[PDB]
Symmetry: C2
Subunit: 127 residues, 2 copies
């Protein structure tokens, strides 16, 4: 498993779906941050979802150390570009990772203009 800003066995993956059109939510910007020593959020990784609504390759197993991470989904620009003025500014998922060892995390979000749902699927690696 590789080291730095690429994809190991992809420890963090984000998947976003659209509940109004019944399709993946394409081109949604995603920003990830790690809480720093000094209690503030430092930028950790970023990207855009693909044609299938997924974003892989945000980090490696070597760079994804234990910590508190924040994944911010720009849902507002997403809906605005489809001409809807949605309710939320963005959708955020904050969680503690790899505190009992490394794990793979998939963060999924289902979006509607006035509602969002999020779920996480966590698997214990090995290959």
């Amino acid at each position: 498993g590789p080291t730095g800003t690429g994809e190991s066995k992809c420890p963090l993956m984000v998947k976003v779906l659209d509940a109004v059109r019944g399709s993946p939510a394409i081109n949604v910007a995603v920003h990830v941050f790690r809480k720093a020593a000094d209690d503030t959020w430092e930028p950790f990784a970023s990207g855009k979802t693909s044609e299938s609504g997924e974003l892989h390759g945000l980090t490696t197993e070597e760079e994804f150390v234990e910590g508190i991470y924040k994944v911010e989904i720009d849902t507002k620009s997403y809906w605005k570009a489809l001409g809807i003025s949605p309710f939320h500014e963005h959708a955020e998922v904050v969680f503690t990772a790899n505190d009992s060892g490394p794990r793979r995390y998939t963060i999924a979000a289902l979006l509607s203009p006035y509602s969002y749902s999020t779920t996480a699927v966590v698997t214990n690696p090995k290959e």
Copy 2:
């Protein structure tokens, strides 16, 4: 039940449900904040949900002016009290409050240990 920063017509209400037990999520801490010129968040109101899982009297119409607000729900303390290991650190809902539109805002949240869903009901009448 409870309250916050003083009781009026109830321009903002929060309701929290438990998907694991099919009940209202009681005694959950809720904090609300208003975004400031310097872009940081300032405390605005807070409280704990009552027996029916609702939190009212957080603000009043004079004080609730346009801006961007953040509602933070301490979901982690809620699952720990139940003996469940939860995934999220808390649930946040960030939205812009506008005059133009409707006035009553109900933010509802349905919690599971690895997943949460949030919806907003914005009306002209009550609740």
